[PDB]
Amino acid sequence: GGSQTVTGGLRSLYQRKVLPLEEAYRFHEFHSPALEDADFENKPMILLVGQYSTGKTTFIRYLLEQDFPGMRIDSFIAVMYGETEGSTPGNALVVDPKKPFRKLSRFGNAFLNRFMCSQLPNQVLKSISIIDSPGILSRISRGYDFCQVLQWFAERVDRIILLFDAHKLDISDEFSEAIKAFRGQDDKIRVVLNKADQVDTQQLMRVYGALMWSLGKVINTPEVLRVYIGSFWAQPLQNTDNRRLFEAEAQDLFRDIQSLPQKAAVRKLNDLIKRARLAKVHAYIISYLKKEMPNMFGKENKKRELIYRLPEIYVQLQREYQISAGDFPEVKAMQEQLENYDFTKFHSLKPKLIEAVDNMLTNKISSLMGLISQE
Amino acid sequence: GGSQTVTGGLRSLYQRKVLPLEEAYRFHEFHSPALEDADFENKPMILLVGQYSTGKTTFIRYLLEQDFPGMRIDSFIAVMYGETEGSTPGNALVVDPKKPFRKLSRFGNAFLNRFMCSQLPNQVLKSISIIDSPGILSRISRGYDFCQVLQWFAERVDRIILLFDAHKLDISDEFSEAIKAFRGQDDKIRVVLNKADQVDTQQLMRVYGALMWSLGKVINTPEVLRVYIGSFWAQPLQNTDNRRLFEAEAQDLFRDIQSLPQKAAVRKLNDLIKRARLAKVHAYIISYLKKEMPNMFGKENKKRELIYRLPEIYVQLQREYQISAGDFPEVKAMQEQLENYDFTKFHSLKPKLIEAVDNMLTNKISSLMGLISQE
């Protein structure tokens, strides 16, 4: 709801202020194409990795506080918002251009047959999407590369939740192999020690301790991971000795997840800023190239002189516009592309378009970050 | 007290039954010398490794339930039993032949000046000895190799206790370097998470979790370590939310330490058994060598034939005495030593002496293990 206003504000600011400066200097043919409305309406995703019978399917029902189609308390499920409670098989989901699952077609039927999108109107899903994963075992035989599909979600997911069972902590080689496939994205990982009320207090310490022991043994990062310890479902507690703990841990978890759409808003706001800066540089470059072109003859001779002297051009522009060499595009990649452009057809500099962007960066953004601040 | 009877029983059984079979065939000149009474009166030792201000000195006062000389709540201290409360500086301790600290002389004054033996009549010390260690810091500058002296205690100690502070868990590089020096003896290690009542329940989980995380990150062993979580001193509890836990953990700790003298008794009982078996083999070998020697001439010629055919002798004896080739001494090491012996001066086989040992192994040991069983 509130972050749908943020989404609208970003799209608006981009189309009114940034996009015209990209189109004026063919930004989209050099670097990246125009941003579609899909680039803005992204809800942060969560990947649930956990062995069989850990409680992932219940964990989802616990957050949503509601059932979802084809939940059945094994395959991949993408739980997302939807006007009506419905289910979409994977073979059809990977064709939907309004879904991030279009690239998943590379794994094929053996995977698609074990892939589904369950939709339902639920508050949680208005803000984020949950991707359940098949329960890892503790033999093997899947007609798709299970460790590569897991890897693929991890790179496009905002949060990864390793799920472990305090009643039966049995980290398997397959699970460990999956965790080693998530490395390089440890900041996305959190852990959940479920069914904590099933064991007595001493046993919880042995299990929880043996968990961290073997995790750090695997991830080999000085940055210890966060483990939310509790019993995550609607049922009563068995071993109430740590009731207060399990409740604070659940609140710490709800706060983590509830922050994801906010963190995403900022990430998008920063990406829009960086894009708007790159567009400025691109406009200053093309403009200078146009400025120097002769009024009539020696056009192809001047074009090649500019391309060869492009490194000097960069420094020329950095100084007379106080801009960083960091948001400049790579020198050689430009030169390779500037070969294919009639320099004389470029547009002279349009101060009207740059002012529109600089007025966005100085004034218009301070308010959005204020709209994000009001959680 | 009770394990002083075990000590006496072992010494008695060795002197009455084993030692005469070793002396009859010069066992002590080939393999290992006669066992002194010191070889039996060993009390298991404990090495306390822990950073500064963790509470080691209090931890010791907690177990003993009593002060000890020069405790001062930094240097090595060997807390051991003693008729009277006294203190012995290190420069004099390393000269005492009735102390295992005679080899420590290799590190010298810079270490000896930071080494002491505090004695006192205390029940705990009748059974075991505690070796406090200087508090590791969290700079460096000691005039002795701190990581080599620690290593030296670890190899002769029965139990190593890593001590950590839940109020300020700051594993330092020096401490980690020490823990890496204990590897290869992980079975001796236990951990103690002290001051657990100082933090709230959630913070305990973060600290305890971060501990195991970085420990397994260091020791790299699939065998997770045991961490006794509590507040180990006579004072009341601050955060009573986990009173029951901290009490069971302390009892689990007292049971671990209280078992050490029993485990040692068994280790000695097994070592005596293995020695008595090796003595038998040695007696059968020397006897056979004597048996084959000619009654008069060709003595040096026969001696060399036997030594060369000694591998065949081993198999000859293994079969006609149903004994394992495992407790046989190395073939070549014997041959190198059998050069220096007038074979004709050996003694013929003495069935009287072997029966004395076999009667010890069949009958006399079943009772000692019963004396150990009665904890």
Ligand SMILES: Nc1ncnc2c1ncn2[C@@H]1O[C@H](COP(=O)(O)OP(=O)(O)O)[C@@H](O)[C@H]1O
């Ligand atoms: N918080 C909990 N405490 C104890 N048992 C639970 C809890 N949550 C789920 N379970 C049990 O664990 C089983 C596994 O549930 P499910 O989530 O379907 O498996 P998976 O997590 O592998 O999808 C269920 O039968 C349920 O009864």
Ligand SMILES: Nc1ncnc2c1ncn2[C@@H]1O[C@H](COP(=O)(O)OP(=O)(O)O)[C@@H](O)[C@H]1O
């Ligand atoms: N169980 C405990 N809980 C809280 N504080 C403690 C506990 N035991 C000791 N302390 C405090 O920690 C400090 C360090 O004590 P000491 O054992 O002398 O240091 P070290 O362990 O480095 O020898 C002491 O001043 C004491 O007040």
Ligand SMILES: [Mg+2]
């Ligand atoms: Mg599931």
Ligand SMILES: [Mg+2]
């Ligand atoms: Mg101390």
